Amino acid sequence: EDAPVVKLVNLILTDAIKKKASDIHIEPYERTFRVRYRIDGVLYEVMKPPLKLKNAITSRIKIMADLDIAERRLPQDGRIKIKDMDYRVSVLPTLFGEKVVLRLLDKSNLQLDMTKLGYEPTALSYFKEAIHKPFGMVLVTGPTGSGKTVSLYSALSELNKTTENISTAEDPVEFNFAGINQVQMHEDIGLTFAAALRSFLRQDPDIIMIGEIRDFETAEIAIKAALTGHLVLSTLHTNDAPATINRLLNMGVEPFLVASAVNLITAQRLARRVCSECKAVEEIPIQALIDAGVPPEEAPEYVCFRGTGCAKCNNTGYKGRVGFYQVMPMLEEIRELILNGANTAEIKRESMRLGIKTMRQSGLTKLKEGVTSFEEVLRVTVADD
Amino acid sequence: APVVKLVNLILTDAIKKKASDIHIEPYERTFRVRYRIDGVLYEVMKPPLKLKNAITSRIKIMADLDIAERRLPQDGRIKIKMMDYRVSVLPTLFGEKVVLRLLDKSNLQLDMTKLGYEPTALSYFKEAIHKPFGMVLVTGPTGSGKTVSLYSALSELNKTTENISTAEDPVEFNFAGINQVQMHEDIGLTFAAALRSFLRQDPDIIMIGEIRDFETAEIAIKAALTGHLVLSTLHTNDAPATINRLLNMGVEPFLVASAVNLITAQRLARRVCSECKAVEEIPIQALIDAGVPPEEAPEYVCFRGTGCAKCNNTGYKGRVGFYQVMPMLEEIRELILNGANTAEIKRESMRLGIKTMRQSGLTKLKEGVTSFEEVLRVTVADD
Amino acid sequence: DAPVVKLVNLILTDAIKKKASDIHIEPYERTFRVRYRIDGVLYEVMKPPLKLKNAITSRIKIMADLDIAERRLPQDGRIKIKMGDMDYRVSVLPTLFGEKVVLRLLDKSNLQLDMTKLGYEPTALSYFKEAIHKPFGMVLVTGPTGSGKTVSLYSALSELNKTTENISTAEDPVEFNFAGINQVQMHEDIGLTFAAALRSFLRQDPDIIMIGEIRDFETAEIAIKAALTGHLVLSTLHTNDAPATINRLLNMGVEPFLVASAVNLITAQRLARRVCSECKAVEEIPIQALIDAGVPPEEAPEYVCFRGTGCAKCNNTGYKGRVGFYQVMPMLEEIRELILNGANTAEIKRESMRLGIKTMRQSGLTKLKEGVTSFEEVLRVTVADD
Ligand SMILES: [Zn+2]
């Protein structure tokens, strides 16, 4: 329908990099057509192109990704690599044409260094200890969008030596890693996690990464792989790390296997980072900090900040995101609790007895260093009564 | 009586009477027209039988339906000058029966505040919809407004900062800014098919028309556990049964416990006419057996409609909703893992202050919006 | 094909010369490599040209009789390259950027053909020897791949390999070249299926017949009919436990009285790791866990559970050898009666346990008591007995 589509498409992808966007959404509707950038978890409408180019745009992208242009009724998935910048494409048949989703994959703005992820010193020591063990299971819990896969990616980079077979099963595979054998799931064809995980055992493996353990079938296989002499990395969506014990048991797993096989259970969430420009002090009462869980001796030296709202923060008061981490090694004391039928709260206490900081405590540490607001800590975490 | 005018008459009269569906029914010795008003069919007209074929054919002409085929069923639509209709013709033994369903998207409420939730219930409903993940199931039978409650949730979340994706069979409301996918199983576009694609496209909120099978249920729940917000419906009696429906389908129990945030259940009841509103002497023993606590039985003021022009002598004008909103509370999660049956769960929910549909119905009765008969008609006592 | 077959041949030959244990053919977005596992560590060996990534893997799939039109889901097969030999098990895995192929060496150097040395418990072995030395009937040895089921099968043939008996065999592929055993290797492309070879055996004045695996109704039906005619039939299936193997055959379409009359025994087995004899350490396992594992409480405290600490001999794994957990279920009158009354799997499992047929879990707990395997290894490999 027109000719300078390639200049338009190139702009939409490039501008997304300049804006440090994480995802691109190209959405056609009956009378409107829009482009949205997801930046720090929030979608902003960027472009409202003319509808005559909607089919020109999608087809230009589909050829870039080796997708069937005649198929506008079923969803398609491919990849795009541009000059050294690759994208992940997903096409979906909206009511009025195909919706396109591109996720930005630039390592340049991806941190693969555990030191730079905001782990506290004591916790990070436990995290490195478990991933460098020669076998066992390491679980990084959290929901989607909590940075949990970034913790995994940084671990694989530390382990990605040419002497070890690292296999990977994700839904979907995001970052193409060199020397790492990544498998994207496809449930319609029978390529489930268990299917790849069973195939991995037939693949002379050393390290195995699983996107998430969602059902008993996958859990059993993943644990037994960690027992057979393999390093198993995976995620679950649990509230805190102590609950991940009774999550696996509620799935139907025998407890003695959980005690023997799990080496570590990380739990983390992402919180908004205050804008460095409209940064304003908030006089929070000391009893409010104590009721939040701050040790009283350190309550006065706290200087709680917040963003007023400016242009740079798009009036959100926040810019980047920041992580609250809980790193709970499977200490001898925790193993005994699992076998005596301990509940979640009982495990939570003994972990804190042994100096295992909760996500709330990690948040109060970020608050003290002045990167997050008091509201954002209470929003994301739960107090440790 | 002219046929074209009469057809327009039966369609317009249905609008004035706020009817939802029109039934044009030929039989061996009679011919009648019925309006669906507040869920109940009333005989409206008894035209002469000679016009049975004239009327149905006129409607088919209005609907662009094959007039040469009177032996097989046909389906179409009508849009007139003011209001669109959905038409279905069915070959009865004695002529064609025609059904028109009124499609009132213009006067359609897509705001949870206008749905008649009681304050406590609405608080739980809002709490669960604004959570960053989890499943919300809106149960009820066909014609219970459950799809209206579902869309009301989407409208509440429909901000430009969130990717709301949707899979329906068929799509009901064409929504702007909502990425809607209409199902097509013959080409392989099932709920499971679209739902798998949604995860690969950076979603925030997902709506699934209905959970009909294990395949869709398992996938939808696992997606809601992964950290996405999933909305769907089922056809179950109350909210507690929706738990053992999912479990009887084959879902692993921890998923039902961990992933579901809330289960709504609803029925529709007639609303008493505001004009012929008369108090009705209901015996107190009847109220206590209905579930009224005896201490509060005298202060109930039971109403009924006498019959006026505005209520079309029905005594009722418009509908009112009886809702049961059961958040997946820590206590109920515990029951699921201990293999509790449905009746046990209903008890613990009621212990924790989750009004049943009967209890919600009696609340509208006390507020003077429903008749006592309409409570007993629609719900079942809690024994 | 000219440079790919040369390259394919190089990858297999160099792997033999370099005494590799596993071969890794790895495609990536812009790179392509082959790694050999030598003494547990992978070394980068070759960096072939990227144009050949799909050509090489596909040729190997042909060498393994693998569907080459299917490049999306994983596949597994075998390769036998002969000498004066070395066979491999191949696995294809659909990476994001093509198919990854892995070859594992199967040298079978330590091969036991003495039923006594397989770790069968005494009561079990007696039941097993009884059925194979019966003059006819069927004996099924079930289990997953890598459970020694074919080793138990061959060990049975060695006990029967006398010069008075016509032993014919149909395998896909033939494993061990046995003297005096008439071995027929399957060749599906030319019509040499199990059923095809099985039919010819009846025309061959047979005594004992071994079939690699009963995977199909055609094969199952005839093999059963052969065991009724007065021939000894040995085969395998991939089933969870011995009682379910009955309802496996029944779901295939076999009439139940045939299963009752023709089956003499159904073995089921799984392999578990053997604790290292050098770093062997006693482990205080809680008693309630043992009772819940299925140990009768009266004998539970006297259990002395071991595990490996980690030494040089065990490569710090704590384990060395393999150990077998066996379930041997003779077709006793009680089980035949259940089969004829349409009993389900759980009922048969119960009645076998009433009749003293130790399950794989129960057999595992005995090896645990004898101090050859760990408690974790019992739970990993077996299933609790309700
Ligand atoms: Zn700012």
Ligand SMILES: [Zn+2]
């Ligand atoms: Zn009235």
Ligand SMILES: [Zn+2]
């Ligand atoms: Zn050792």
